[PDB]
Subunit: 379 residues, 2 copies
């Protein structure tokens, strides 16, 4: 498969078996084609579809509210907002791109993967429509920055913590490599998206917000580099991917994993089991890319000898029994998120206990959740 943000091994196996006419896969792909129809008809979304504008006055600037910040009832204007870790302020849904970036990302991802497997031009054409409108359109496309992502009313300093929102559209950016060579994705479309991705990569690496997020001591730094790798892989910068793995990702794992394999930065969160898992999901998506060029982030040690497999080891019994978790978790943990994580970690590590547990937890055969498309093996 082309370099991108997916399990390349599972995708190739699906395309092989679908082209071979294998019955199990052909039936699974035909279900996925029924799921995917809503995306062929779906009107492409745009970040410009908001009423309340950013401080730049530019509807093309992405802006969201940082989810745990709330009006202060003891202030006349509610300002400045105050933090309630783990309590999502429903005001976030007043920023349309919060859910629209997810909807776009789901649509482009599903369509791009279904085009790669089946070769049907109708999937590239619709995938292309979503990509053009979201990224490159001179009126509807988003500016390549995350300046106003997770803004906070009344906050005086700028932060880069909102960059983590980018994972919702950076996976779709990656899957665009899958429609290159279709009739619908012209050389001109590719150049524009290449140029947008080049400007976004530049902003990520050189803006102050980008630099600060690249140095975050918790799961934000890990997601920053996972996003970084999707952009770099889209741009075919294989040397930079190696450099990011060795100079940023591995040192981060070495610092954030304690000797017992816990992630202390996530243990202090009110949703500590969710955020431990979310840290590892960043590594999981990062590894999907690094493992396509021979770097296994699950088993490759940092300079201090720590390996991401130690973090999985620490959490595994709590994926078996979340009720055993001893740290603060003020909402129930969704065990299903462990399925893909334990499958990904298990195959990379040769740990059949992890792979077995992934299949016992399982994914629903008929689920329309787009990230589960490659994982027939769990269905």
């Amino acid at each position: 498969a082309p370099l991108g943000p997916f399990n390349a091994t599972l995708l190739e196996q699906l395309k092989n078996d679908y082209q071979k006419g294998e019955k199990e896969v052909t039936r699974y792909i035909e279900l996925q084609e029924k799921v995917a129809e809503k995306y062929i008809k779906m009107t492409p979304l745009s970040v410009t579809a908001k009423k309340k504008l950013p401080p730049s006055k530019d509807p093309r600037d992405y802006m969201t509210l940082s989810p745990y910040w709330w009006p202060d009832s003891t202030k006349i204007d509610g300002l400045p907002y105050i933090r309630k870790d783990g309590e999502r302020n429903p005001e976030v849904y007043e920023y349309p791109e919060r859910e629209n970036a997810n909807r776009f990302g789901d649509a482009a991802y599903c369509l791009g993967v279904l085009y790669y497997i089946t070769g049907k031009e109708v999937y590239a054409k619709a995938c292309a429509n979503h990509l053009r409108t979201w990224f490159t359109d001179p009126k509807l496309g988003m500016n390549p920055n995350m300046t106003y992502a997770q803004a906070v009313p009344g906050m005086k300093k700028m932060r880069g913590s909102g960059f983590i929102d980018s994972r919702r559209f950076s996976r779709a950016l990656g899957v665009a490599k899958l429609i290159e060579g279709s009739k619908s994705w012209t050389p001109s479309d590719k150049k524009k998206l290449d140029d947008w991705a080049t400007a976004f990569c530049y902003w990520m690496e050189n803006s102050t917000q980008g630099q600060r997020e690249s140095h975050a001591a918790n799961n934000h730094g890990l997601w920053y580099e996972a996003i970084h790798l999707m952009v770099l892989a889209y741009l075919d910068r294989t040397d930079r991917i190696r450099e990011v793995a060795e100079q940023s990702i591995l040192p981060k794992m070495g610092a954030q994993i304690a000797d017992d394999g816990s992630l202390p930065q996530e243990l202090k969160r009110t949703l500590s089991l969710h955020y431990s898992t979310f840290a590892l999901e960043a590594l999981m998506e990062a590894n999907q890319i690094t493992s396509q060029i021979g770097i296994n982030l699950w088993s490759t040690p940092a300079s201090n000898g720590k390996v991401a497999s130690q973090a999985v080891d620490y959490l595994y019994p709590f994926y078996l029994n979340p009720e055993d978790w001893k740290f603060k978790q003020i909402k129930p943990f969704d065990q299903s998120r462990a399925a893909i994580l334990l499958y990904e970690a298990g195959t990379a590590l040769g740990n059949q206990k992890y792979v077995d547990t992934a299949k016992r937890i399982g994914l629903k055969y008929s689920t329309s959740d787009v990230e589960t498309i490659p994982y027939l093996v769990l269905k």
Copy 2:
């Protein structure tokens, strides 16, 4: 006497008295509240018709919301029919603007009407009136007097009345409209239109199939149904019906829901059992605010089966002290601050100084903008 309505009339009268006498503590408190209220004077009045997606009637004046715990079924091609996940609010609810707009309207009308009652300044009646007219009686912007499409569920075949509980967000504003009667801005015509609207809503809640079913609910929905019923009846000055509902429906319903140890078994089975135990009692609390103004104390009056609502407070009191001690399912954190007004209301109605003391110890923030706390200087 304050007009009959959905508030602690004793505290409101105390506030108006002291404010008019010029007592310093109250005058300063009311001047804070006037600063808080300023946003409501400037606020553009909201309307249920400010939606894009219409209800099956095709009428924008029909209130419509999504039942909050119903989610798309990802294993279905269309996500239909939705499935229930108790206690997990589907953010799709925020796609129905009247869900939050009913709250915002309710807050503004409540705050402004109470501030007019306390202070006598016409500017509060005038703004309160603007919000009431637009929400209720306006021939284009006012809501139709029904809750047919409240908490609808995609793909569900049966009609339900469970969405009626949404009405509490605007039924308190309806009640407070009595406080601006006699202002210059609230004309005789305004009163008649709202009287007529309230009559039609009372007819709908009592005679529609959805209203009848909700009136028979065996959990907190039945309690809130009667609390809402009382707000409407008190607005309409139907004191004989208030007595009848208190004696023939609320007290038997309340007695039926209290187990021998004072627990509320219907609420213990919920994923948010401490929230819904508290929510059941808040219904009784607001109902008692109306019944006690005509001599019926719902906290201390036993039902005919011998249960009394004070038993339910007794069961929950130690867990209001220490919410972490709660042993039943509570998949989100419980807000202890909700115990403050509840224990003060029950504590005063019962002469229980331990409840009142704890209420003041938990307390409310002196400067909070939460409009339901306006009468509770005593806790601030």
